[PDB]
Amino acid sequence: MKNCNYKRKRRERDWDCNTKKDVCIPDRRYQLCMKELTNLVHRDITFRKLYLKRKLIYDAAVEGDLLLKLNNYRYNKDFCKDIRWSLGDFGDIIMGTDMEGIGYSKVVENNLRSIFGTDEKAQQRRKQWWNESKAQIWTAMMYSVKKRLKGNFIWICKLNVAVNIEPQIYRWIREWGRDYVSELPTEVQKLKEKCDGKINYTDKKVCKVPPCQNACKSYDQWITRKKNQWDVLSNKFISVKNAEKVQTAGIVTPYDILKQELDEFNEVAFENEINKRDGAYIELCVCS
Amino acid sequence: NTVMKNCNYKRKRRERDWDCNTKKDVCIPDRRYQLCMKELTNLVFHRDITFRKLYLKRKLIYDAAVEGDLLLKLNNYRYNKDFCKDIRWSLGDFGDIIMGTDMEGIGYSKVVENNLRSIFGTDEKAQQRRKQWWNESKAQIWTAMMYSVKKRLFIWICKLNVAVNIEPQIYRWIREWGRDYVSELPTEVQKLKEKCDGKINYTDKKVCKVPPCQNACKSYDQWITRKKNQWDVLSNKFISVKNAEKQTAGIVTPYDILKQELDEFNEVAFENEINKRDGAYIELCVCS
Amino acid sequence: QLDFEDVWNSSY
Amino acid sequence: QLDFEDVWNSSY
């Protein structure tokens, strides 16, 4: 219920790699609105399928409305992507390929087994259903927008991109890379303000100046979480990419994802940063 | 009327005569009243394509199969002419109900008609859409009615083309009424002969002084009088409905229908009978 | 007493 | 604070 009231500030809570040790969960996913999907649960299959779409469409409109509010009611790259990330998570939950499976999520899955059954090809039927309903789900998420631009809404966010099917880990890595480049500049700035330069003619500030040492410890903690998050996500990517058809348009390594989502991406520099051996870090936080 | 009762069993043929008192301008056959619509009644804002293309179709198809199964049992599981006509009559009424041109419109039939107004809409062309829906579905509905027979063997002794051919409801009802009339006539005349045939004395017929015979003729009068009223109502309804369309070839007068349904039909003899001026009635029930 | 699914399937 | 029906109707 609370998930359908107020979305926490972006990056207020960091990715959680402690619940399921093999996966790293974004706060957005934890807050994914599934009120109706949870509180649900005759013979006719096609009927329940429709009763399902009804509740999903409403949850989608609420989710979309809240993401718009989280974005301070601005139509921009950031809004359109949160819509993608959340649309996809719905898709996986529907297709039984979600990696979270916590608390009320387990319930939602039970209700889905109660609708599509548990037989062999039941999974196939859940895939086709979604592949037939998604464009309407996306439209439902765009309700608050469509409510105001009345038809021009389709020129804000690209439909053909949102509805495109992608493994969950794929999308999460994009979202994570996006969060990483947002945080890095801030964290590095904090560091410079207190650690830039020497304390005498030969020794770096970090050698004696406590405020700097405090800053360096903070950074260490931050970059260490990033290092751990990437490790988990990228290894999950390989794992999942070794257990499916895994034929994607120009995606071989998890780095190729970042190369698509980020500007002038440089993996050598990226690995230097998360392993505390980049030029900035050595200069500021290493006494020798 | 009912809904569940008439989906469990049918009353014996001609157990209840046609009804001219409910709607004064039309006579309704018991079969029509007993028409199975259970599922179609509990049909029902979810006006999706699948709702009318699948859901609706599924509940009607199931309704058809139950109807056909009961008609088979009504016919003592005989797979003959009479069974095929019943299937045809009920198939046609389903058709008129879907197309919104049914002449019964009583009780739960009003409920169903509303359920169809919500599904197809109530605009100008909604009528035409309902026509196309039936036209592109009737073949399947007919098949469902044969499910019971098909479950043993089916498309042969009962012909598809004859049944799926659209015909004004009043046309079909006249044919059905004619079949019921010629089934009753012999029995009723028989009752008469076996009490009134011949003279009580040398010159006076039994009907003159023999009460048991006089009572017999009274009973005959009642039967033939109902038949008389029923034909008058139906035949005028025919002219009424025919005048309000643009038409069926081969049929100009309501008698042409009786000619197409019964062997060696004599319109002159028919009129004499229902008007109590035929040779038999005159000889048996008219004193002088 | 009628197999709803067999009826639906048989109608095709 | 969201009219369910309008959301549903708009989805089509």
Author numbering:
A (entry chain B): 214 to 254, 262 to 508
B (entry chain A): 211 to 254, 261 to 369, 373 to 465, 467 to 508
C (entry chain C), D (entry chain D): 19 to 30
What does the paper say about this structure?
DBP is a member of the erythrocyte binding-like (EBL) family of proteins, which localize to micronemes and use Duffy binding-like (DBL) domains to bind specific RBC receptors with high affinity. DBL domains are located in “region II” of EBL proteins, and DBP region II (DBP-RII) is required for formation of a tight junction between Plasmodium and RBC membranes. Two crystal forms were observed, a heterotrimeric complex in which one DARC molecule binds the DBP-RII dimer, and a heterotetrameric complex containing two DARC molecules bound to the DBP-RII dimer.
In the second structure, two DBP-RIIs each bind two DARCs (DARC A and DARC B) creating two DARC binding sites. This architecture creates a heterotetramer, with a total buried surface area of 3628.6 Å2. The heterotetramer structure has a larger translation along the same interface in the same direction, with a second 12 Å displacement relative to the heterotrimer, and a 23 Å displacement relative to the unbound DBP-RII homodimer interface. The directionality of these transitions is consistent with sequential steps in a stepwise mechanism of receptor binding. In the heterotetramer, DBP1 residues R263-I265 and DBP2 residues F261-D264 contact DARC of the opposing monomer. The heterotetrameric complex shows that the DARC molecules are bound in parallel, resulting in a Plasmodium proximal face and a RBC proximal face of DBP-RII. Because only 30 amino acids, DARC residues G31 to S60, separate the structure from the RBC membrane, the surface of the DBP-RII dimer with DARC Y30 is proximal to the RBC membrane, and the alternate surface faces the Plasmodium membrane. Due to avidity contributions to binding inherent in a two-site mechanism, this heterotetrameric complex may enable the observed tight binding of P. vivax to the RBC membrane. The heterotrimer and heterotetramer could represent DBP-RII binding to a DARC heterodimer or homodimer, respectively. The crystallographic and ITC solution studies presented here support a step-wise binding model in which receptor-induced DBP-RII dimerization facilitates formation of a heterotrimer that subsequently recruits a second DARC molecule to form a heterotetramer.
